[PDB]
From Swiss-Prot:
SUPFAM superfamilies per UniProt: P-loop containing nucleoside triphosphate hydrolases
Organism: Salmonella typhimurium (strain LT2 / SGSC1412 / ATCC 700720)
Molecular function, one GO term: identical protein binding
Entry EC no(s): 7.1.2.2
Protein name (Swiss-Prot/TrEMBL): Flagellum-specific ATP synthase
Catalytic activity: ATP + H2O + 4 H(+)(in) = ADP + phosphate + 5 H(+)(out)
Purpose of the protein: Probable catalytic subunit of a protein translocase for flagellum-specific export, or a proton translocase involved in local circuits at the flagellum. May be involved in a specialized protein export pathway that proceeds without signal peptide cleavage.
Record-linked InterPro entries: AAA+_ATPase, ATPase_a/bsu_AS, ATPase_alpha/beta_chains, ATPase_F1/V1/A1_a/bsu_nucl-bd, ATPase_T3SS_FliI/YscN, FliI_clade1, P-loop_NTPase, T3SS_ATPase_C
Chain positions recorded as ATP binding sites: A148, G149, S150, G151, V152, G153, K154, S155
Protein family (similarity comment): Belongs to the ATPase alpha/beta chains family.
C-alpha cells in the first residue's frame, strides 16, 4: 500500500502532480500503461512550491495518461564490488555486466566531516607525473583543478594519473562528456590496467541534466565510502564545467533567474558543496585527493565557473594551447599553475631547485623573442646562460610520454641531476 498522488499537468519538460508531497530532491515514480502491463518512469521532485508537486523526468514520458498515479521510491550500491565497473548516476551497469552484487548501499547525501576533524595535508601523493610531483607537488587530500580547453591532452593527462598515481582506488566521474569520448576514455585512455583499479561513473552530455548532477554526487559518495574503509582515493571529476551547466539547465526550467554569466545563484552554491566533500578524512583512516576539471574558452579568467573554481580549490594545473600545438606534452603551463600545499610538503633543498627551475624557465621564454635574431650576445645575464644550456634538459624533464611512469623518487632523482649536487 502507498500514498499516491496523480499527474495533473504535462505541458512541458516539468510536470505537475497532485495529492502527494515529497522533499526537494526525491525520486518520484510516474506510472504509464503499456497496454495491459505497467511500467515505471523516473522523475525527480524539483520543487514542492506551494502550488503543486513539480516533477522533472529522468526518462522519456511518451505514454503517460492524464492523472497518472505517482508515488515515492534513495539507496545506491557501494563497496569493492564497484572496482572495474562502469555505472551511471543511478548505479545501473553501463559495461554489460549485471548490477554489482551489493549487500551494502547508502544515501547519496550523507553529512560531511567538520572542516575541523580532517587531518591536515602533510603527505605527498605520487601522481606518477614528473612535472607535477617535482614542480607542483600534490598532497594527499588536496583538491586540485585542471584547467584546459579542448584538444590539449586533458583526457590523456587524467589517464596517466589514473594509471600511475599511488592510490588505493580511483573513482572517475565523467559528467557531461560526449559519449564517444567517454567510451574512448574507458577503452583507450584507461585500458585494462586502469579499469581494474577504478570505478567509473558515466553521465554523458546527451543524458538528463539531473542524471549528470546525480552522477557527480554518486562518484563523490563512492570516494567517500572508500575513504571510510581506510582507503586512499584519487577522485577525478570531469568536469565541474558540465556539472554547473547541468545545474543551469535545471534551475532555468524551474524559474530561477540567471545571476552572472547567465548562470543562476544556485549554480554557485552547488560547486563549493561538491568539491568540499573531497579532502583528507579523520586520519588513521583514509583520504580523498581529487582533480576537478574546468573547461577554458580559449583562455578566459572572467568565466564565472573558472573564477569560482580557482577560489575553492587548493591549487590548479593549467594546460596550454601553445604548448599543445607545439608538441609539448603534458601541456602543463608551470608559470600559470600552482599548488598551495607544495611548500609545506617539500624540503627546502627540493623547493630551492623548484624556484630555480621556474626562474630559468621564465627568463628563457620572454627572452625567446629576442635571441632568434642574433641580438643576444651571450656572456651576459648568467641566468640566461644557465637557461638555454639546461633548457633541452628541462623541456625533456617536463615532457613525458603516455606510457612513461615518473615515480616520486624518479622525479626527484631526475631533478637532482638536472640541477644541483644532491
Amino acid at each position: 500500500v502507498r500514498r499516491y498522488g496523480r499527474l495533473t499537468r504535462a505541458t512541458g519538460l516539468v510536470l505537475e502532480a497532485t495529492g502527494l508531497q515529497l522533499p526537494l530532491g526525491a525520486t518520484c515514480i510516474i506510472e504509464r500503461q503499456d497496454g495491459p502491463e505497467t511500467k515505471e518512469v523516473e522523475s525527480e521532485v524539483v520543487g514542492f512550491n506551494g502550488q503543486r508537486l513539480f516533477l522533472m523526468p529522468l526518462e522519456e514520458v511518451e505514454g503517460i495518461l492524464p492523472g497518472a498515479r505517482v508515488y515515492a521510491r534513495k539507496q545506491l550500491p557501494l563497496g569493492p564490488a564497484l572496482l572495474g565497473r562502469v555505472l551511471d548516476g543511478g548505479g545501473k551497469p553501463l559495461d554489460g555486466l549485471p548490477a554489482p552484487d551489493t549487500l551494502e548501499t547508502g544515501a547519496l547525501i550523507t553529512p560531511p566531516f567538520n572542516p575541523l576533524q580532517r587531518t591536515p595535508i602533510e603527505h605527498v601523493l605520487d601522481t606518477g607525473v614528473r612535472a607535477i610531483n617535482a614542480l607542483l607537488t600534490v598532497g594527499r587530500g588536496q583538491r586540485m583543478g585542471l584547467f584546459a580547453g579542448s584538444g590539449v591532452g586533458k583526457s590523456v593527462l587524467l589517464g596517466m594519473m589514473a594509471r600511475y598515481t599511488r592510490a588505493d582506488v580511483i573513482v572517475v566521474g565523467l559528467i557531461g562528456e560526449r559519449g564517444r569520448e567517454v567510451k574512448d576514455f574507458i577503452e583507450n585512455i584507461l585500458g585494462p590496467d586502469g579499469r581494474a583499479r577504478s570505478v567509473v561513473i558515466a553521465a554523458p552530455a546527451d543524458v538528463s541534466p539531473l542524471l549528470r548532477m546525480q552522477g557527480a554526487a554518486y562518484a563523490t559518495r563512492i570516494a567517500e565510502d572508500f575513504r571510510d574503509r581506510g582507503q586512499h582515493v584519487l577522485l577525478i571529476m570531469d568536469s565541474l564545467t558540465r556539472y554547473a551547466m547541468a545545474q543551469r539547465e535545471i534551475a532555468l526550467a524551474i524559474g530561477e533567474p540567471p545571476a552572472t554569466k547567465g548562470y543562476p545563484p544556485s549554480v554557485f552554491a552547488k560547486l563549493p558543496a561538491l568539491v568540499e566533500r573531497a579532502g583528507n578524512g579523520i586520519h588513521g583512516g583514509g583520504s580523498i585527493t581529487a582533480f576537478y576539471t574546468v573547461l577554458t574558452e580559449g583562455d578566459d579568467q572572467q568565466d564565472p565557473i573558472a573564477d569560482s573554481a580557482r577560489a575553492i580549490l587548493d591549487g590548479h594545473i593549467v594546460l596550454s594551447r601553445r604548448l599543445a600545438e607545439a608538441g609539448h606534452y603534458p601541456a602543463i603551463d608551470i608559470e600559470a599553475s600552482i599548488s598551495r600545499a607544495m611548500t609545506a610538503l617539500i624540503t627546502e633543498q627540493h623547493y630551492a631547485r623548484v624556484r630555480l627551475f621556474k626562474q630559468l624557465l621564465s627568463s628563457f621564454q620572454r627572452n625567446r623573442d629576442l635571441v632568434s635574431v642574433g641580438a643576444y650576445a651571450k656572456g651576459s645575464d648568467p641566468m640566461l646562460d644557465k637557461a638555454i644550456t639546461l633548457w633541452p634538459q628541462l623541456e625533456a624533464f617536463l615532457q613525458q610520454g603516455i606510457f612513461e611512469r615518473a615515480d616520486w623518487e624518479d622525479s626527484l632523482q631526475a631533478l637532482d641531476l638536472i640541477f644541483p649536487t644532491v
